[PDB]
């Protein structure tokens, strides 16, 4: 009963492909299950996206008001819909992209980062600047969530995104003030209750960014801290391609994979 066997039973039971990665630490081996297989980013890109915007600009740029119209809202945009008439600051947009996975907000940030038509390449660029040669973004919201299985476009791997996240929240990719903005937004994420959060004890701190898409895609990327402040990164990615484009994703698959992880991490 190694951990791969547990993860395998999750795949059989949920009729799903599961990718897990937890980086090695000074005292823990890496946990890897299909860690180098590709999976669609879905909204998980929005956390490194906010880092890219933060990194490239002074903090005052978060005060810049971005105006848009209803025609820009071509995907699920719970916060952009409430502020359509009055606009949103760059900071508000980072907030919305992360905490509510707002589609329009991510697209506007992509435009800020690389101009219209340059955003996805510029975001991909930021990942390469962090030594991630694997991940790629090619489309905006909503198309990015809708590539077919096996399409390399708009994919990362659990391994690659976990190491990106580690550098962003736990290493020195961002200065401490910008880093804390990113961390705070992910800590107050509202979409992640039934995924990695549900598999860690309440006294562990969890920050995360979810992703959901076609072919039953459900992702979550988290940084967690043990009750005495020991940090770990957890990438949990999944799809259910057998049910077709409209396949229902299963959040409980992620909660279980995360419970497996937490079980290993919390035991002495």
Ligand X SMILES: *C(=O)/C=C/NCC(=O)CCO
- Strand boundaries in 43-97, DSSP class E: 65-66, 88-89
Per CB under 6 A, which region of 80-88, 124-132, 206-214, 234-242 contacts ligand X? Answer: 206-214
Q: In degrees, to the nearest 5, what angle opens at C-alpha 195 toward C-alphas 129 and 77?
A: 70
Judged by CB under 6 A, does residue 119 bind ligand X? no
Residue from 76, 230, 264, 266 that binds ligand X (CB under 6 A)? 76
| Closer residue to ligand X, CB minimum distance, 158 or 265 | 158
Judged by CB under 6 A, does residue 192 bind ligand X? no
Coil/strand/helix, residue 63 = helix
Residue from 23, 48, 91, 213 that binds ligand X (CB under 6 A)? 213
Which residues does 122 contact at the CB level (< 8 Å), separation at least 6? 52, 110, 113, 114, 115
Minimum Å gap between C-beta 39 and ligand X is 12
| Closer residue to ligand X, CB minimum distance, 171 or 242 | 242
Residue from 147, 211, 251, 265 that binds ligand X (CB under 6 A)? 211
One symbol per residue from 15 to 44: x for binding ligand X (CB under 6 A), - otherwise; what is it? ---------------------------xx-
| Closer residue to ligand X, CB minimum distance, 42 or 223 | 42
Minimum Å gap between C-beta 5 and ligand X is 30
Judged by CB under 6 A, does residue 212 bind ligand X? yes
Structure tokens at 92: 């508000």
- Binding-site size, ligand X (CB under 6 A): 9
Minimum Å gap between C-beta 182 and ligand X is 17
| Closer residue to ligand X, CB minimum distance, 43 or 124 | 43
Cis before 198? omega within 30: no
| Residue corresponding to tokens 């992209």 | 97
Per CB under 6 A, which region of 81-89, 180-188, 211-219, 237-245 contacts ligand X? Answer: 211-219
CA distance 156 to 153: 9
CA distance 109 to 90: 7
Judged by CB under 6 A, does residue 101 bind ligand X? yes
Burial class (CB in 10 A: 0-12, 13-18, 19+), 268: exposed
Judged by CB under 6 A, does residue 48 bind ligand X? no
Backbone angles phi, psi at 235, to 5 degrees: -110, 120
Coil/strand/helix, residue 231 = strand
Long-range contacts from 179-185, C-beta under 8 angstroms, 24+ separation: 181/54, 181/62, 181/94, 182/47, 182/50, 182/51, 182/54, 182/98, 183/207, 183/223, 185/50, 185/94, 185/95, 185/98, 185/99
Residues acting as catalytic residues? 43, 141
Judged by CB under 6 A, does residue 173 bind ligand X? no
Judged by CB under 6 A, does residue 145 bind ligand X? yes
Residues that bind ligand X (CB under 6 A): 42-43, 76, 101, 103, 145, 211-213
């Amino acid at each position: 009963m190694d951990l791969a066997d547990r993860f395998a039973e999750l795949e059989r039971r949920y009729d799903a492909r599961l990718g897990v990665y937890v980086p090695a630490t000074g005292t823990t081996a890496a946990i890897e299950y299909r860690a180098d297989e590709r999976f669609a980013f879905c909204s998980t890109f929005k956390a490194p996206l906010v880092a890219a915007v933060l990194h490239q600009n002074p903090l005052t740029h978060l005060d810049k008001l971005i105006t848009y119209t209803s025609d820009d809202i071509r995907s699920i945009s719970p916060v952009a819909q409430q502020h359509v008439q009055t606009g949103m600051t760059i900071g508000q947009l980072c907030d919305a992209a992360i905490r509510y996975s707002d589609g329009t907000a991510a697209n506007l940030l992509l435009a800020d980062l690389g101009g219209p038509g340059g955003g996805t390449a510029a975001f991909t660029g930021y990942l390469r600047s962090l030594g991630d040669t694997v991940s790629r973004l090619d489309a905006e919201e909503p198309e990015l969530n809708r590539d077919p299985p096996g399409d390399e476009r708009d994919t990362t791997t659990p391994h690659a995104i976990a190491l990106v996240l580690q550098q962003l929240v736990l290493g020195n990719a961002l200065p401490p003030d910008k880093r804390a903005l990113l961390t705070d937004w992910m800590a107050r994420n509202t979409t992640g209750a039934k995924r990695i959060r549900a598999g860690f004890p309440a006294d562990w701190k969890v920050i995360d960014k979810t992703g959901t898409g076609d072919y039953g895609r459900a992702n979550d990327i988290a940084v967690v801290w043990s009750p005495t402040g020991v940090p770990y990164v957890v990438a949990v990615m999944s799809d259910r391609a057998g049910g077709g484009y409209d396949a229902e994703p299963r959040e409980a698959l992620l909660a279980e994979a995360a419970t497996c992880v937490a079980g290993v991490l919390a035991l002495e």
